[PDB]
Swiss-Prot record, chain A:
First and last residues shown, out of full length: 152 to 188 of 528
Name this polypeptide is given: Negative elongation factor A
Subunit structure: The NELF complex is composed of NELFA, NELFB, NELFCD (isoform NELF-C or isoform NELF-D) and NELFE; NELFA and NELFCD form a stable subcomplex that binds to the N-terminus of NELFB. In vitro, the NELFA:NELFCD subcomplex binds to ssDNA and ssRNA in a sequence- and structure-dependent manner. Interacts with the RNA polymerase II complex when it is not phosphorylated by P-TEFb.
Protein family per UniProt: Belongs to the NELF-A family.
Biological role: Essential component of the NELF complex, a complex that negatively regulates the elongation of transcription by RNA polymerase II. The NELF complex, which acts via an association with the DSIF complex and causes transcriptional pausing, is counteracted by the P-TEFb kinase complex.
Tissue spec. comment: Ubiquitous. Expressed in heart, brain, placenta, liver, skeletal muscle, kidney and pancreas. Expressed at lower level in adult lung. Expressed in fetal brain, lung, liver and kidney.
Domain comment in the entry: The HDAg-like domain is essential for transcriptional repression, and mediates the interaction with the RNA polymerase II complex.
Residues carrying Phosphothreonine: T6
Originating organism: Homo sapiens (Human)
Compartmental location: Nucleus
From Swiss-Prot, chain B:
Function: Essential component of the NELF complex, a complex that negatively regulates the elongation of transcription by RNA polymerase II. The NELF complex, which acts via an association with the DSIF complex and causes transcriptional pausing, is counteracted by the P-TEFb kinase complex.
Free-text tissue specificity from the UniProt record: Widely expressed. Expressed in heart, brain, lung, placenta, liver, skeletal and cardiac muscle, adrenal, thyroid, kidney and pancreas.
This protein's name: Negative elongation factor C/D
Protein's cellular compartments: Nucleus
Superkingdom classification of source: Eukaryota
Subunit structure: The NELF complex is composed of NELFA, NELFB, NELFCD (isoform NELF-C or isoform NELF-D) and NELFE; NELFA and NELFCD form a stable subcomplex that binds primarily through NELFCD to the N-terminus of NELFB. Binds RNA which may help to stabilize the NELF complex on nucleic acid. In vitro, the NELFA:NELFCD subcomplex binds to ssDNA and ssRNA in a sequence- and structure-dependent manner. Interacts with ARAF. Interacts with PCF11. Interacts with KAT8.
Name of the gene this protein is made from: NELFCD
Family to which this protein belongs: Belongs to the NELF-D family.
Length: 37, 174
């Protein structure tokens, strides 16, 4: 109904991963710890 | 259930199910309003801030929530507490600058750099803008489209260091 989604234009290829995703992994460590609980 | 329980550490306990469940858009909005009202309390940064991490899942995984997240952090980038000194205020501001640089990396580049230009011309000290440029030129890969240069480089005229700034200015003027 609301029409299709258009993905954003990528002005440049990322040579690395943002530090946000690094922090997501850092907190996924404690996520796996909770999985161990 | 989690949000109205008035959660911090327990968030990190069930952050797995959270980032599993933020993929639902409406749930992402709900957590955004919850963390907004928790973090918008005066002096919520003196006691746990894990909540600012969750925007990373939201904005990265939902494109149309880029306008909200920045338009949340515009308030948080103006945080000022007499208890948490200007050093800690600048720490939180630089943290939020890293968040805004990440959100720029997702394509929300015109309004980010426009507001950065406005608050430098205003509030935001030259140290914060220099740290912005430091993190940006440390993370952004060339080529740099002129739609981004047109606001990033003429505000970068104030400084010349973070050398990556010299490389950026030379590449983007040549």
């Amino acid at each position: 109904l609301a029409g299709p989604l258009t993905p954003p234009v990528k002005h440049f290829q990322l040579k690395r991963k943002p530090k946000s995703a690094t922090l997501r992994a850092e907190l996924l460590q404690k996520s796996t710890e909770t999985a161990q609980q | 259930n989690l949000c109205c329980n008035e959660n911090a550490s327990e968030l990190v306990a069930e952050l797995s199910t959270l980032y599993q469940c933020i993929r639902f858009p409406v749930v992402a909005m709900g957590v955004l309003k919850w963390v907004d009202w928790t973090v918008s309390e005066p002096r919520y940064f003196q006691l746990q801030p894990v909540h600012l991490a969750l925007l990373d899942e939201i904005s990265t995984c939902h494109q149309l929530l880029h306008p909200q997240v920045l338009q949340l952090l515009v308030k948080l980038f103006e945080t000022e507490h007499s208890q948490l000194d200007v050093m800690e205020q600048l720490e939180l501001k630089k943290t939020l600058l890293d968040r805004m640089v990440h959100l720029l990396s997702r394509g929300y580049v015109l309004p980010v750099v426009s507001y950065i230009r406005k608050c430098l011309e205003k509030d935001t000290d030259i140290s914060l803008i220099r740290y912005f440029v430091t993190e940006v030129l440390d993370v952004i890969a060339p080529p740099y489209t002129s739609d981004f240069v047109q606001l990033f480089l003429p505000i970068l005229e104030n400084d010349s260091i973070a050398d990556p700034v010299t490389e950026f200015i030379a590449h983007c003027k040549s």
